[PDB]
């Protein structure tokens, strides 16, 4: 599914991501924009052989099982395929675990490089929330 901007902001708020660990909804929308372009079916293979999955490009080294990332963990206790669903529940629940890990949203390199310290409230401007 390719979400609209305000459609995704609303879905993330419905699942309790707004201000989760102190991160406003515009931070999450911005991270999803640059990670996936709001496409739940986004995938990216890393040099190390891990794969990033879904709207927030969650990685197989720690967070989900794909059966093809040697030595990896599955801390969200999900198949990585669950992160590609039209329903963002699995992505949101796993994102809450990642952002609680100690480095906040710096876990998402694209958030640190493209969203951090920007006017992220622009990402929810105009949305009926
Ligand atoms: Cl957009
Ligand atoms: Cl915001
Ligand atoms: Cl594996
Ligand atoms: Cl595990
Ligand atoms: Cl599995
Ligand atoms: Cl949803
Ligand atoms: Cl933090
Ligand atoms: Na894994």
């Amino acid at each position: 599914k390719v979400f609209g901007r305000c459609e995704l902001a609303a879905a993330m708020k419905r699942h309790g991501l707004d201000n989760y660990r102190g991160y406003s909804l515009g931070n999450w929308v911005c991270a999803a924009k640059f990670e996936s372009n709001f496409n739940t079916q986004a995938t990216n293979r890393n040099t190390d052989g891990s794969t990033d999955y879904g709207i927030l490009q969650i990685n197989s080294r720690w967070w989900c099982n794909d059966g093809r990332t040697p030595g990896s963990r599955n801390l969200c206790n999900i198949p990585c395929s669950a992160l590609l669903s039209s329903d963002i529940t699995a992505s949101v629940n796993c994102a809450k675990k990642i952002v609680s890990d100690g480095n906040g949203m710096n876990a998402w390199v694209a958030w640190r490089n493209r969203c951090k310290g920007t006017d992220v409230q622009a990402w929810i401007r105009g949305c009926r929330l």
Side-chain angles (χ1 to χ4, degrees):
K1 174 178 172 173
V2 178
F3 276 78
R5 182 180 55 89
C6 290
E7 184 189 14
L8 183 59
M12 284 178 158
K13 182 168 185 184
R14 172 155 107 77
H15 295 270
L17 246 199
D18 56 310
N19 214 225
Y20 191 89
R21 281 280 162 159
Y23 289 95
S24 66
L25 187 57
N27 283 284
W28 295 105
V29 174
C30 184
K33 176 70 176 178
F34 295 126
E35 287 292 5
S36 67
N37 209 12
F38 301 151
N39 186 354
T40 68
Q41 297 195 82
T43 65
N44 174 67
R45 177 61 46 78
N46 299 304
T47 55
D48 74 353
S50 71
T51 303
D52 307 322
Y53 297 86
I55 56 151
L56 284 173
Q57 288 292 273
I58 289 174
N59 187 87
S60 64
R61 172 75 184 74
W62 291 104
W63 305 108
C64 62
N65 179 237
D66 64 8
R68 56 149 283 124
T69 311
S72 76
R73 300 286 293 282
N74 177 15
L75 297 174
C76 291
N77 303 300
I78 46 163
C80 295
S81 63
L83 299 170
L84 300 190
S85 180
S86 58
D87 181 322
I88 70 165
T89 301
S91 287
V92 167
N93 288 347
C94 185
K96 288 180 180 175
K97 291 186 175 57
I98 297 169
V99 74
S100 301
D101 182 65
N103 294 307
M105 288 194 71
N106 294 294
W108 290 272
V109 172
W111 175 88
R112 181 173 52 75
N113 288 331
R114 306 180 70 174
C115 298
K116 184 178 193 179
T118 72
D119 179 28
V120 297
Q121 189 284 324
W123 288 97
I124 69 173
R125 180 163 301 140
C127 302
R128 195 176 183 85
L129 292 169

